[PDB]
Write a protein that binds this ligand. Structure first.
Ligand SMILES: *[C@@H]1O[C@H](CO)[C@@H](O[C@@H]2O[C@H](CO)[C@@H](O[C@@H]3O[C@H](CO)[C@@H](O)[C@H](O)[C@@H]3O)[C@H](O)[C@H]2NC(C)=O)[C@H](O)[C@H]1NC(C)=O
Ligand SMILES: O=C(O)[C@@H]1C[C@@H](C2CCCCC2)CN1C(=O)CP(=O)(O)CCCCc1ccccc1
Ligand SMILES: [Zn+2]
Length: 585
């Protein structure tokens, strides 16, 4: 047979394999927004009904050769139907336990309807009572972590079996194989080192001021930071305390909260301003199928659902939905853009076959939305839209401008790095089950300098307390994002004439790229490829480079770096930390 002959058959397998994706995807959405035993029994069926399809599509099998092997990645479909159900069953048992968790208020046993979103999320983000933050910290982990230890161990062994039947060493080889570059696990390690001098200086700064506020008894000047004081359950972002520990408080903030309240903001209003951005870039306009079938507010009926913001692609055409329990605050506003970046990416490669209907690599997907967040963060873009007015950006302000960006986005790179670095150690057998917990906190202490609020033990199993852990969702994507999103932001700040390496008062940190079609067109082209071309090619269409480069982000925070170096010295603050003793064996 000729080239077209083999291609004439794949297209017949493209659709047949693409329909059961939507069936399995739609059934996954039902259980995603309506946690019911009935919906779980239907999600796993469409999955099993799908695995039967992928299993058969494999044996039945330049662009061509890619498809013949890009459509056969079983994933977990290599296991027998009984083990396939057993794997997804253990996973859902963790995600279910994660989204259904409810808690009793601190000091009130009669009120026991508190949930992660909104109560717990906003308690940590705004309460400055240590004993309270600690109480909710233990309650959250003892409820979402250890109770699913047994289900997790089952999920691991089957994830490893699937990796073997797919011809791989362990689960780690799978997630890494997604980036298709044996020299990538080492690339990441290199970038973290390039970031360590900056993060530690910022870490020391935060710790000292956290010691100012709460006192020395609660914050050791030489030990890791109690993570429950960083305004976030997982300490992945410290934005919720940026104002609480700001360099110069007698300055203008960038909360953009009350001015969202004053101007009567609604969850739908926010998403509109997001659609308003992509359109200005000559990109896709948010369709109506999204306005209808999406969930942009926590349902006030009482069902059980996964409030963890997400964006879905049911394949087919133009059916894009976002499930986010939105609230009125600046933090949520950026969460929207991250989800919209996922929706946009769907609309760009929807004209591709089922194989190439995905981002170049997991990093691109997560990065898209945050790239706009970089421009929105700027006062320039916030000043255009009333949210930000009378903002006399001084030199100090630009420090707070660089500071917030650090405690918000910089501290997240070490966090995202440790997550997958740990799971890889569990898949590769480097972490025995008898030491699951204290090896996790050992990494969190080493690479982020934060420790639990109370002494944990191996009886506890805290990793599942993170959504992505209980849901089996790779997190390195979020790390790669925070590295490439500055490269994209760079090549997008240059095509909008908003960045020239050296530009004094036209900084790469104040680069607002609204109404830039040239940047959009080039962005549309990269997203259009999806998984059609290797990610180096997609990497080049927009950035011009073909490798992940920390030069962008390193240039972003260098102004903050120089102020921390000079400031930590004067403040007489300690840098670095001793090992954490908050986990015993
Ligand atoms: C969350 O999922 C559950 C599934 O366990 C949904 O229950 C289902 O609700 C629909 C109606 O929304 C039921 O269909 C109805 O059947 C009656 C006859 O009994 C018919 O007259 C109605 O026109 C409608 O077709 C369905 O039977 C029911 N399934 C089960 C197993 O109870 C629930 O509605 C979902 N929640 C939300 C908020 O969507
Ligand atoms: O909160 C977190 O932990 C991270 C970081 C944060 C992000 C946006 C705000 C600014 C900081 C970075 C938000 N988020 C997300 O995972 C949101 P998603 O759309 O990727 C959610 C991706 C998971 C999709 C899924 C759902 C069900 C089954 C399988 C897969
Ligand atoms: Zn994402």
């Amino acid at each position: 047979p000729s080239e077209t002959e083999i291609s004439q058959i794949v297209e017949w397998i493209e659709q047949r394999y693409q329909q059961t994706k939507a069936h399995q995807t739609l059934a996954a959405w039902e259980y995603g927004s309506n946690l019911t035993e009935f919906n779980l029994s239907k999600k796993t069926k469409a999955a099993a009904d799908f695995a039967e399809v992928a299993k058969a599509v494999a044996e039945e099998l330049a662009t061509l050769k890619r498809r013949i092997k890009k459509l056969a990645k079983l994933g977990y479909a290599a296991l027998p139907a009984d083990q396939f159900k057993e794997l997804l069953g253990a996973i859902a048992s963790m995600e279910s336990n994660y989204a259904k968790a409810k808690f009793c208020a601190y000091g009130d046993a009669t009120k026991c309807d508190l949930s992660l979103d909104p109560e717990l999320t906003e308690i940590f983000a705004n309460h400055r009572e240590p004993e309270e933050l600690k109480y909710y910290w233990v309650q959250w982990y003892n409820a979402t972590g250890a109770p699913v230890r047994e289900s997790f161990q089952k999920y691991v062994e089957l994830n490893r079996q699937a990796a073997l039947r797919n011809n791989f060493s362990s689960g780690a080889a799978v997630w890494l194989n997604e980036y298709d570059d044996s020299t990538f696990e080492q690339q990441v390690d290199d970038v973290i080192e390039q970031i360590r001098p900056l993060y530690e200086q910022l870490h020391a700064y935060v710790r000292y001021k956290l010691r100012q506020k709460y006192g020395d008894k609660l914050v050791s000047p030489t030990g890791p930071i109690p993570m429950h004081l960083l305004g976030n359950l997982w300490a992945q972002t410290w934005d919720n305390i940026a104002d609480f520990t700001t360099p110069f408080p007698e300055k203008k903030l960038l909360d953009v909260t009350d001015e969202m309240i004053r101007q009567g903001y609604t969850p739908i209003k926010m998403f509109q301003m997001g659609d308003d951005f992509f359109t200005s870039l000559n990109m896709t306009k948010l369709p109506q199928t999204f306005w209808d079938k999406s969930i942009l507010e926590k349902p006030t009926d009482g069902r059980d659902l996964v409030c963890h913001a997400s964006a879905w692609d049911f394949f087919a055409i133009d059916d894009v939905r976002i499930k986010q329990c939105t609230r009125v605050n600046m933090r949520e506003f950026f969460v929207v853009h991250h989800e919209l970046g996922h929706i946009q990416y769907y609309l760009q490669y929807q004209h591709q076959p089922v194989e190439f209907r995905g981002g170049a690599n997991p990093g691109f997907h997560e990065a898209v939305g945050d790239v706009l967040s970089l421009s929105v963060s700027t006062p320039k873009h916030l000043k255009k839209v009333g949210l930000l007015k009378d903002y006399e950006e001084d030199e100090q302000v630009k420090i707070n401008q660089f500071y917030r960006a650090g405690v918000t986005k910089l501290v997240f790179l070490p966090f995202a790095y440790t997550l997958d670095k740990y799971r890889w150690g569990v898949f590769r057998g480097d972490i025995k089950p008898r030491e699951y917990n204290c090896k996790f906190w050992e990494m969190r202490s080493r690479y982020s300098g934060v420790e639990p609020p109370v002494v944990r033990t191996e009886q506890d199993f805290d990793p599942p307390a993170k959504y992505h852990v209980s849901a089996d969702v790779e997190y390195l994507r979020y790390f790669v994002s925070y590295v490439i999103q500055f490269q994209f932001h760079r090549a997008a700040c240059a095509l909008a004439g908003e960045y020239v390496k050296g530009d004094p008062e036209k900084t790469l940190n104040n680069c607002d790229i609204y109404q830039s079609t040239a940047a959009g067109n080039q962005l549309k082209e990269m997203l259009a490829l999806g998984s059609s071309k290797p990610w180096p090619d997609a990497m080049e269409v927009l950035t011009g480079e073909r490798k992940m480069s920390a030069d962008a982000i390193l240039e972003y925070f260098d102004p903050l770096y120089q102020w921390l170096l000079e400031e930590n010295k004067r403040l007489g603050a300690h840098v670095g930390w001793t090992d954490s003793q908050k986990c015993v064996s």
